[PDB]
Amino acid sequence: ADEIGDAAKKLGDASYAFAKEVDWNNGIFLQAPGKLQPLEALKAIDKMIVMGAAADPKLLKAAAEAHHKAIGSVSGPNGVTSRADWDSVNAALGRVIASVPENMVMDVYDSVSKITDPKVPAYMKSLVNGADAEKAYEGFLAFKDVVKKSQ
Amino acid sequence: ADEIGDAAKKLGDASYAFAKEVDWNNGIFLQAPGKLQPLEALKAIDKMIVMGAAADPKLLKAAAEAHHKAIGSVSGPNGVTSRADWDSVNAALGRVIASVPENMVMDVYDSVSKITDPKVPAYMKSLVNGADAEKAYEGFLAFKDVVKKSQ
Ligand code: CHL
Ligand code: CHL
Ligand SMILES: CCCCCCCCCCCCCCCCCC(=O)OC[C@H](CO[C@@H]1O[C@H](CO[C@H]2O[C@H](CO)[C@H](O)[C@H](O)[C@H]2O)[C@H](O)[C@H](O)[C@H]1O)OC(=O)CCCCCCCCCCCCCCCCC
Ligand SMILES: CCCCCCCCCCCCCCCCCC(=O)OC[C@H](CO[C@@H]1O[C@H](CO[C@H]2O[C@H](CO)[C@H](O)[C@H](O)[C@H]2O)[C@H](O)[C@H](O)[C@H]1O)OC(=O)CCCCCCCCCCCCCCCCC
Ligand SMILES: CC(=O)O[C@H]1CC(C)(C)C(=C=C/C(C)=C/C=C/C=C/C=C(C)/C=C2C=C(/C=C/[C@@]34O[C@]3(C)C[C@@H](O)CC4(C)C)C(=O)O/2)[C@](C)(O)C1
Ligand SMILES: CC(=O)O[C@H]1CC(C)(C)C(=C=C/C(C)=C/C=C/C=C/C=C(C)/C=C2C=C(/C=C/[C@@]34O[C@]3(C)C[C@@H](O)CC4(C)C)C(=O)O/2)[C@](C)(O)C1
Ligand SMILES: CC(=O)O[C@H]1CC(C)(C)C(=C=C/C(C)=C/C=C/C=C/C=C(C)/C=C2C=C(/C=C/[C@@]34O[C@]3(C)C[C@@H](O)CC4(C)C)C(=O)O/2)[C@](C)(O)C1
Ligand SMILES: CC(=O)O[C@H]1CC(C)(C)C(=C=C/C(C)=C/C=C/C=C/C=C(C)/C=C2C=C(/C=C/[C@@]34O[C@]3(C)C[C@@H](O)CC4(C)C)C(=O)O/2)[C@](C)(O)C1
Ligand SMILES: CC(=O)O[C@H]1CC(C)(C)C(=C=C/C(C)=C/C=C/C=C/C=C(C)/C=C2C=C(/C=C/[C@@]34O[C@]3(C)C[C@@H](O)CC4(C)C)C(=O)O/2)[C@](C)(O)C1
Ligand SMILES: CC(=O)O[C@H]1CC(C)(C)C(=C=C/C(C)=C/C=C/C=C/C=C(C)/C=C2C=C(/C=C/[C@@]34O[C@]3(C)C[C@@H](O)CC4(C)C)C(=O)O/2)[C@](C)(O)C1
Ligand SMILES: CC(=O)O[C@H]1CC(C)(C)C(=C=C/C(C)=C/C=C/C=C/C=C(C)/C=C2C=C(/C=C/[C@@]34O[C@]3(C)C[C@@H](O)CC4(C)C)C(=O)O/2)[C@](C)(O)C1
Ligand SMILES: CC(=O)O[C@H]1CC(C)(C)C(=C=C/C(C)=C/C=C/C=C/C=C(C)/C=C2C=C(/C=C/[C@@]34O[C@]3(C)C[C@@H](O)CC4(C)C)C(=O)O/2)[C@](C)(O)C1
Ligand SMILES: [Cl-]
Ligand SMILES: [Cl-]
Ligand SMILES: [Cl-]
Ligand SMILES: [Cl-]
Ligand SMILES: [K+]
Ligand SMILES: [K+]
Ligand code: NA
Ligand code: NA
């Protein structure tokens, strides 16, 4: 057990209602988030590859395992995993983020933002309960503060 | 140095002319290869996650590093990496494939095939030199025999 695991449980309280409202079977997620821009996207994918090579290999292993278990507990019409697996996944991802330098994480966020159309967040939010999405995000902000403290 | 590295060099002789003919900047690769079928695709993605968790963590690390280096040497109008980086990537991927049980690799191939429209290989091949694609594939068959012997 660790502090990221404790923080993932609080994050789940704040975010699982949002998770249940996303339609994870929507084909939209395979689309570019705006105009397809292969050269810019490749730069973002490169920042991710750099980060994956920097990440602790045992923690990437554990984060993959957690996703395989989450897939096994999917149910209902939106394809949402169990509450327990939602928290497990978030904690395992938090540990991966904490295993690399902060600049590597920001480089991914910046490089993806560059290819992401300004309308995309609002359109995503419009398909769920707005208050639940806001509560999820304030949850994320509290969680990332625990993650940073392990980083 | 190892036998997979030697085999990757022969594979490059057989396949790099094909690599140069693919338009890696074509947006088509972001499309589902046929009808989008999220439940079946998730099963294929699950076989991959299982395989990634089973793979040797040092070899997955090295395979990511090899891709970051390959991205740095991209040139020309099709976005093709250098011959040296093409071989490096193939050897590092060969080592990853050899680090997991054969059944895990076949499970991915079967689960992806299930969502892949029968027209897709021929359409892909139609955008390149057919003889070069055939020479690439016969190269692959020789390479996978070396990979299997390390497996
Ligand atoms: C079928 C498998 C599968 C699916 C469908 C997804 C889906 C996703 N992954 Mg995951 N992953 C999957 C397998 C795996 N992933 C990962 C490792 C990662 C990493 C390292 C990351 C992702 C992230 C993401 C998200 C990227 C898009 C995004 O940011 O949306 C928005 C995100 C959500 C809807 C997820 C919940 C986030 C938050 C706790 C609550 C919601 C807050 C806000 C309302 C919206 C988000 C705001 C931003 C600024 C944080 C997306 C939800 C990324 C992500 O979520 O970025 C924030 C991310 O950083 N995945 C591994 C390797 C261990 C997997 C397999 O093993
Ligand atoms: C920008 C980054 C990036 C891009 C564009 C790609 C693109 C691709 N990856 Mg790669 N990857 C990338 C980063 C990374 N990959 C991987 C790990 C993997 C793995 C483990 C595998 C792929 C494979 C593939 C291919 C999947 C589709 C396919 O099978 O087409 C057809 C494939 C090609 C055109 C590639 C050349 C194959 C062969 C040597 C020559 C051509 C033979 C035939 C003519 C066509 C293929 C026949 C099939 C039956 C083998 C595709 C070419 C898969 C693959 O190639 O399956 C065969 C695969 O197994 N990637 C990692 C983690 C280390 C990456 C980042 O770090
Ligand atoms: C070949 C196939 C390969 C596939 C490759 C696929 C990967 C790339 C696919 C792209 C997917 C991107 C779409 C993501 C949208 C989700 C982000 C979002 O809604 O974000 C919403 C935010 C909203 O903006 C924020 O809005 C906030 C509002 O807060 C206010 O309001 C809050 C609650 O309402 C609180 O009150 C809070 O305290 C208060 O300040 C603040 O103003 C912040 O400053 C501001 O950042 O937008 C922002 O961040 C702007 C930046 C958004 C850019 C995207 C960021 C995602 C980075 C994640 C990296 C993952 C990469 C994707 C793939 C990885 C999978 C492994
Ligand atoms: C949210 C975003 C997340 C993104 C997720 C994305 C991943 C999934 C995206 C799907 C991409 C799939 C499209 C791939 C097409 C390439 C395969 C192909 O052209 O294949 C061509 C072959 C042609 O068929 C073969 O044709 C051969 C012909 O050989 C003959 O001819 C030869 C030379 O002409 C030689 O002479 C040879 O000796 C002689 O026998 C033989 O008959 C073989 O038995 C027969 O298999 O088709 C076959 O195999 C049929 C099976 C094809 C199924 C696809 C196989 C790919 C499996 C790779 C796993 C990678 C998964 C993809 C993503 C992974 C990235 C990490
Ligand atoms: C081989 C293999 O398994 O690889 C594995 C690799 C990983 C990394 C482990 C993995 C993973 C995680 C991944 C890829 C996550 C990807 C997330 C993608 C999110 C995409 C989104 C939000 C896309 C869009 C597109 C939208 C378009 C919106 C608009 O166009 C619309 C409607 C109309 C316009 O008028 C206005 C508009 C509003 C602009 C939008 O609103 O959102 C996975 C899945 O496991 C597969
Ligand atoms: C060896 C091997 O196999 O590697 C493989 C391993 C993987 C994992 C499968 C793999 C992969 C994918 C990877 C690395 C994905 C990485 C994702 C990174 C996500 C980062 C995020 C969300 C960062 C942020 C930063 C944010 C900042 C927000 C704020 O600053 C803002 C704006 C304003 C301030 O006022 C307050 C603030 C709130 C602070 C934010 O909100 O989010 C890959 C590439 O395939 C390689
Ligand atoms: C088709 C289908 O059914 O798919 C199903 C597939 C599944 C897997 C079963 C499934 C599921 C679950 C899923 C997808 C869960 C996704 C979770 C994503 C979690 C992401 C996390 C936590 C990302 C971050 C990024 C962080 C960055 C933090 C920092 O940068 C920040 C901000 C500010 C810096 O100053 C400091 C910092 C510390 C660097 C962080 O702290 O955390 C579901 C729902 O069932 C759908
Ligand atoms: C070949 C093939 O078929 O592969 C298949 C493989 C799969 C895995 C099966 C597959 C899949 C599934 C995938 C990747 C699913 C990804 C889901 C990502 C979902 C993202 C969502 C919800 C994003 C948001 C962002 C939002 C932002 C809200 C806010 O910012 C807003 C507006 C205002 C801020 O002030 C406050 C805020 C509240 C922060 C929100 O509310 O939500 C797919 C697509 O089927 C393809
Ligand atoms: C966060 C992050 O970085 O994730 C990283 C995760 C990884 C795994 C490391 C990674 C990687 C590798 C990946 C995903 C490789 C994906 C390969 C996809 C190949 C897709 C293909 C061939 C798609 C199609 C679609 C086609 C459609 C054809 C047709 O419809 C057409 C024309 C008209 C119809 O009449 C007939 C038809 C003929 C049916 C086709 O012919 O082909 C990457 C890139 O690094 C990103
Ligand atoms: C911890 C962590 O981070 O994990 C992350 C790590 C990654 C790597 C980034 C990641 C990923 C992606 C993964 C695993 C991709 C795996 C790809 C597997 C490819 C397998 C292939 C091509 C298999 C085959 C089998 C074939 C057989 C052909 C033949 O039998 C046939 C028909 C007919 C016979 O007569 C002759 C024959 C010729 C023998 C073939 O032709 O091809 C993931 C999911 O994101 C997790
Ligand atoms: C937009 C843009 O510009 O992107 C650029 C991005 C880059 C990265 C810079 C770039 C590049 C290079 C790329 C993509 C290279 C891709 C290489 C893929 C290699 C895949 C390999 C070897 C897969 C396998 C699968 C195998 C399976 C083998 C077996 O199953 C078989 C058969 C039969 C079983 O009985 C035994 C077995 C042993 C189990 C194997 O042996 O090998 C490029 C071109 O520049 C494009
Ligand atoms: C959000 C966002 O924008 O992300 C962006 C991220 C990126 C990385 C920048 C990006 C990208 C690039 C990607 C994934 C590229 C993937 C390329 C895969 C190419 C596959 C090809 C060529 C497949 C084939 C299959 C063929 C088969 C030929 C044969 O079988 C045939 C007929 C007959 C057999 O008898 C013999 C045979 C000879 C075997 C062939 O000849 O070729 C993209 C798309 O821009 C999206
Ligand atoms: Cl505890
Ligand atoms: Cl571009
Ligand atoms: Cl040698
Ligand atoms: Cl389906
Ligand atoms: K509101
Ligand atoms: K021919
Ligand atoms: Na470690
Ligand atoms: Na090892």
Swiss-Prot record, chains A, B:
Residues with site note (Chlorophyll a binding): 67
Function: Water-soluble antenna for capture of solar energy in the blue-green range. Peridinin is an asymmetric carotenoid.
Quaternary organization: Homotrimer.
Domain of life: Eukaryota
Sequence repeat copies, ranges: 2-151
Residue intervals passing through the bilayer: none
Source species: Amphidinium carterae
Protein name, as recorded: Peridinin-chlorophyll a-binding protein 1, chloroplastic
Subcellular localization: Plastid, Chloroplast
Disulfide bond annotation, renumbered to this chain: none
Written domain comment of the UniProt record: The mature protein is composed of 2 almost identical repeat units.
